[PDB]
Amino acid sequence: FALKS
Amino acid sequence: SGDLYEVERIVDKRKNKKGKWEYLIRWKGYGSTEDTWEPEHHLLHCEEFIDEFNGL
Structure with missing residues (x-):
């Protein structure tokens, strides 16, 4: 998982 | 606030100004x-x- 800009 | 989403793969990479x-x-x-x-x-x-992208 990763933060989406 | 930030939203975590699931990653499928990494397609490419680059450097920011701070390295x-x-x-x-x-x-x-x-x-x-x-x-x-x-x-x-x-x-x-x-x-x-990241290892899969650099590996390949």
């Missing part, structure tokens, strides 16, 4: 039109994706 990686993300469930460049500090336990 840290940014990664072009393919998101799980989405095509190439939704790819986004994300700084490394956005990524949670994504080492395997």
